[PDB]
Amino acid sequence: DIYKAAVEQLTEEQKNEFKAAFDIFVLGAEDGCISTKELGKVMRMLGQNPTPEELQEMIDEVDEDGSGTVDFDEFLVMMVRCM
Ligand SMILES: C[C@H](CCC(=O)O)[C@H]1CC[C@H]2[C@@H]3CC[C@@H]4C[C@H](O)CC[C@]4(C)[C@H]3C[C@H](O)[C@]12C
Numbered sequence: 001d002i003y004k005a006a007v008e009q010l011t012e013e014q015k016n017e018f019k020a021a022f023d024i025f026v027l028g029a030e031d032g033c034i035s036t037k038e039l040g041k042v043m044r045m046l047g048q049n050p051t052p053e054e055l056q057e058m059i060d061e062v063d064e065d066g067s068g069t070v071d072f073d074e075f076l077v078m079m080v081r082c083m
């Protein structure tokens with residue numbers, strides 16, 4: 001399909017950046033949360049401009065403990081919502 005060709009068309013630079021981006025994603029959660037900032041940074045590494053407001057919204061809509069971030073259980077609900 002289209003996404004498979006797209007990833008195949010990535011430069012080697014972009015691929016090493018894409019992998020770093022996931023490394024940083026994982027590093028973010030090592031503290032038990034995923035925040036807007038953490039996600040902003042994964043996005044930058046992917047070459048995109050952060051969309052902090054849209055991220056906070058996605059967080060806020062599942063944020064039941066009022067932390068302003070997502071824990072593991074809130075991240076699961078967030079996950080089923082993107083897809
Ligand atoms: C499948 C292509 C490779 C295409 C090719 O053969 O060049 C690669 C290139 C970049 C790869 C992604 C980079 C970030 C992630 C790293 C993780 O550790 C494993 C899953 C992810 C999401 C990767 C999945 C997959 O491995 C991708 C999409």
Ligand SMILES: C[C@H](CCC(=O)O)[C@H]1CC[C@H]2[C@@H]3CC[C@@H]4C[C@H](O)CC[C@]4(C)[C@H]3C[C@H](O)[C@]12C
Nearest residue numbers: 022025039040042043046048058078079080082
């Ligand atoms: C964890 C899964 C899938 C992980 C993956 O395949 O990289 C999903 C659920 C919510 C996803 C994030 C929200 C959208 C974000 C906007 C970008 O347009 C693509 C990457 C980001 C930062 C996403 C990273 C990652 O795609 C997440 C956290």
